[PDB]
Each structure stands twice: as C-alpha cells, then as structure tokens.
Design an enzyme around this catalytic site. Sequence first.
Site, PDB file in Angstrom:
ATOM      1  N   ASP A  56      78.262 133.427  54.461  1.00 34.97           N
ATOM      2  CA  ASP A  56      77.112 134.395  54.702  1.00 34.97           C
ATOM      3  C   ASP A  56      77.468 134.627  56.177  1.00 34.97           C
ATOM      4  O   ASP A  56      77.506 135.744  56.526  1.00 34.97           O
ATOM      5  CB  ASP A  56      75.642 134.001  54.288  1.00 34.97           C
ATOM      6  CG  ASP A  56      75.059 134.260  52.970  1.00 34.97           C
ATOM      7  OD1 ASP A  56      75.812 134.729  52.336  1.00 34.97           O
ATOM      8  OD2 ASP A  56      74.091 133.996  52.766  1.00 34.97           O
ATOM      9  N   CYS A 102      85.517 145.114  51.493  1.00 35.48           N
ATOM     10  CA  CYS A 102      84.346 144.163  51.705  1.00 35.48           C
ATOM     11  C   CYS A 102      82.908 144.885  51.469  1.00 35.48           C
ATOM     12  O   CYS A 102      82.862 145.937  50.654  1.00 35.48           O
ATOM     13  CB  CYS A 102      84.489 143.317  53.050  1.00 35.48           C
ATOM     14  SG  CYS A 102      84.813 144.401  54.428  1.00 35.48           S
ATOM     15  N   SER A 103      82.018 144.582  52.749  1.00 37.96           N
ATOM     16  CA  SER A 103      80.929 145.521  52.740  1.00 37.96           C
ATOM     17  C   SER A 103      81.196 147.039  53.178  1.00 37.96           C
ATOM     18  O   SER A 103      81.360 147.925  52.528  1.00 37.96           O
ATOM     19  CB  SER A 103      79.801 144.902  53.387  1.00 37.96           C
ATOM     20  OG  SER A 103      78.544 144.972  52.667  1.00 37.96           O
ATOM     21  N   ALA A 104      81.572 146.750  54.235  1.00 38.08           N
ATOM     22  CA  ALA A 104      81.981 148.084  55.165  1.00 38.08           C
ATOM     23  C   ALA A 104      83.309 148.397  55.293  1.00 38.08           C
ATOM     24  O   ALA A 104      83.864 149.691  55.435  1.00 38.08           O
ATOM     25  CB  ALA A 104      81.398 148.126  56.709  1.00 38.08           C
ATOM     26  N   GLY A 105      84.233 147.472  54.578  1.00 38.68           N
ATOM     27  CA  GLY A 105      85.754 147.977  54.511  1.00 38.68           C
ATOM     28  C   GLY A 105      86.379 148.001  55.919  1.00 38.68           C
ATOM     29  O   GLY A 105      87.490 148.562  56.073  1.00 38.68           O
ATOM     30  N   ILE A 106      85.897 147.026  56.908  1.00 38.79           N
ATOM     31  CA  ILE A 106      86.672 146.962  57.887  1.00 38.79           C
ATOM     32  C   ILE A 106      86.947 145.577  58.590  1.00 38.79           C
ATOM     33  O   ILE A 106      87.801 145.384  59.405  1.00 38.79           O
ATOM     34  CB  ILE A 106      86.185 147.915  59.135  1.00 38.79           C
ATOM     35  CG1 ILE A 106      84.812 147.575  59.542  1.00 38.79           C
ATOM     36  CG2 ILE A 106      86.198 149.425  58.285  1.00 38.79           C
ATOM     37  CD1 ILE A 106      84.233 148.452  60.680  1.00 38.79           C
ATOM     38  N   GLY A 107      85.808 144.709  58.442  1.00 39.67           N
ATOM     39  CA  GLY A 107      86.067 143.281  59.219  1.00 39.67           C
ATOM     40  C   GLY A 107      86.803 142.468  58.283  1.00 39.67           C
ATOM     41  O   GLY A 107      87.833 142.030  58.462  1.00 39.67           O
ATOM     42  N   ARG A 108      86.245 141.979  57.311  1.00 40.85           N
ATOM     43  CA  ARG A 108      86.968 141.075  56.238  1.00 40.85           C
ATOM     44  C   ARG A 108      88.218 141.786  55.864  1.00 40.85           C
ATOM     45  O   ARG A 108      89.123 140.936  55.855  1.00 40.85           O
ATOM     46  CB  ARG A 108      85.967 140.759  55.216  1.00 40.85           C
ATOM     47  CG  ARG A 108      85.182 139.556  55.673  1.00 40.85           C
ATOM     48  CD  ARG A 108      84.276 139.034  54.270  1.00 40.85           C
ATOM     49  NE  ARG A 108      82.829 138.494  55.106  1.00 40.85           N
ATOM     50  CZ  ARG A 108      81.762 138.152  54.245  1.00 40.85           C
ATOM     51  NH1 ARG A 108      81.817 138.320  52.825  1.00 40.85           N
ATOM     52  NH2 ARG A 108      80.820 137.961  54.657  1.00 40.85           N
ATOM     53  N   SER A 109      88.205 142.908  55.366  1.00 39.91           N
ATOM     54  CA  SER A 109      89.149 143.731  55.007  1.00 39.91           C
ATOM     55  C   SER A 109      90.421 143.765  55.974  1.00 39.91           C
ATOM     56  O   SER A 109      91.375 143.693  55.683  1.00 39.91           O
ATOM     57  CB  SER A 109      88.792 144.998  54.471  1.00 39.91           C
ATOM     58  OG  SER A 109      87.886 144.968  53.217  1.00 39.91           O
ATOM     59  N   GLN A 125      85.935 143.100  63.003  1.00 38.85           N
ATOM     60  CA  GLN A 125      84.416 143.349  63.683  1.00 38.85           C
ATOM     61  C   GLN A 125      83.807 142.485  64.583  1.00 38.85           C
ATOM     62  O   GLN A 125      82.707 142.635  65.305  1.00 38.85           O
ATOM     63  CB  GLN A 125      83.136 143.786  62.841  1.00 38.85           C
ATOM     64  CG  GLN A 125      83.601 144.705  61.544  1.00 38.85           C
ATOM     65  CD  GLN A 125      82.421 144.723  60.675  1.00 38.85           C
ATOM     66  OE1 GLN A 125      82.403 143.473  60.107  1.00 38.85           O
ATOM     67  NE2 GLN A 125      81.804 145.558  60.263  1.00 38.85           N
TER      68      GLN A 125
END
Length: 283
Positions: free
Chosen positions: A181, A215-222, A262
């Site tokens: 989290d 992911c959520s937004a498709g940019i940090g994790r992804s 991010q």
Amino acid sequence: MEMEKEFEQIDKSGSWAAIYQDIRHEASDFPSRVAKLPKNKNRNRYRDVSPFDHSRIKLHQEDNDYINASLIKMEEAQRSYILTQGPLPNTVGHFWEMVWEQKSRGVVMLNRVMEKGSLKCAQYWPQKEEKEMIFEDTNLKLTLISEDIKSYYTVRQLELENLTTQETREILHFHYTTWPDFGVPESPASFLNFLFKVRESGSLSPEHGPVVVHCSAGIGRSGTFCLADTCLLLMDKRKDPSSVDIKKVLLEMRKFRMGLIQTADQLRFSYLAVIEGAKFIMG
Ligand SMILES: COc1cc(C(=O)O)cc(OC)c1OC
C-alpha cells in the site's frame, strides 16, 4: 557510468530527489487533445494523466475510438508495450476490445482492486469458472479457465469470445499481488521472479501482439515494469552492457507516455531491480 557505482553514490549522498527532478524537467511535452475532449470524460480516471495523441491506441470503433492507453515502442531493444489505466466501470468493455484488436497474449496487473481502503479499479475479470462475464457494448465474452495462486503473484487463464463470430482467444493474466500500500518493496527479488514468468510464457515475445500492463494510473508501477525489462535486455544485447544508462532509457520511454515512474523512491527501486537482475544474466 556503471550502474552500481552510480547508485552507490547517489545513495551515500542522498540525492535521489535531485536526480528524479531532472528527469522530470527534460521529459517530453506532446499534445493530448483527444483525451481531453468533453465527450471523453468518463473514460479518464486521473486528470493529470493522459495519453499523447501521437502514440495513443485507437479502438477499432467507428463512433468513439478513445481509450487511455499508449504504445511504447522500443526500437533498439525490439520490444513493444501498451501501458493503460486501471479500468473504470464504463471502460471495462473497451479494455477488452483493445486486448482483442491488439492481439495481445498477456495482461499484467500490478495493483489490487482495493488499496488503502479505496477502489483502484473495477473487477474486470470473472472469479469462478461458471460465472462468466458479458461485454454487451463490445460484443465480447470473458470466461475463467484456471487459477494458480502463489505467494507473491497469481496467474489466470482466460478465454475471450467474439460473440459475433464465435471466435476465441486465450489470454494470460499475470497479477502481482504484494506491492505494498505505501512505498516500494524492500527487496526486488519477487518482482524480478514475476518478470521472468512473464517472459517465460511468451507474453512479451514478438510473435504475439503487445502486452497490456496497468496499475492504477498506468504510469508508476507499470513504468517500473518495463524500464526494468528493457534494460535487462539491452544488457544482453550490447557489447558493453556497461553503457546502458537507466536514466536515458526512461526519458526515451517517456516520449511515448507521460510520467513513467512517479517518485524518487520509485526510481531507486528501478535501479535495484536492474542491478540484481543483471547478476543473473552475466553469470
Ligand atoms: C554506447 O552506445 C552504444 C553501444 C552499443 C554496444 O553494442 O555496446 C550499442 C548501442 O546501440 C546501438 C549504443 O548506442 C549508441
């Protein structure tokens, strides 16, 4: 300069923030007019997160081709990926249409449907064999074939059906379950083990369509996901694996999508994964 020497010195020193910010300041600024049309308002989860016009995936639909998704194309490294936001209740159907038209083999998910007591995405896949899902808007059907639950990830086999023509397509769902989290994982091993399994199934290979990752937004994790893979690959490819510069590869990827990676923490994770990663493919 050698990654580990670089990472050793950025740590020692405390500069992860500085370095992240410099990446941020030189990142590409391409237009995103289509995302912003008024008619496209429920198709976007975050407002500060859009797909460039020049690299966005079009839905093969004659009335609204709009979807929050991008094609990252890496030339040197012979790899393509699609990065996209978590599906919203009204885009579930669009999501699955892209998978189909893009001829993807795999779907990579790096979040949980609920994190921090909030919803991060829709439950976009069926949870029991006999409880299939129907996408009326898109004339598609989705069926759960098999589940294999692990400690750090879950893999699911899914079958898509053109209702229209009765055509079928087998999809592979790779769900990383344990990104915390808050923050970043301590160790990268699990994420690396998760990459290789993704690789092992053929889901990133050239005889298939491009892989869909969110992911959520498709940019940090992804972004961490593909930065790490591309780099690893380049290291096996080039004459001097010591030339691959992670910061450069990232700025490049970002010509295709905004805000890949991010936070500074997230950048440092990225390094670790790559360093450890390489330990394996140089021995
Ligand atoms: C250091 O620069 C490069 C080195 C290598 C290599 O094979 O070591 C390959 C490259 O891509 C064509 C390079 O990019 C310009």
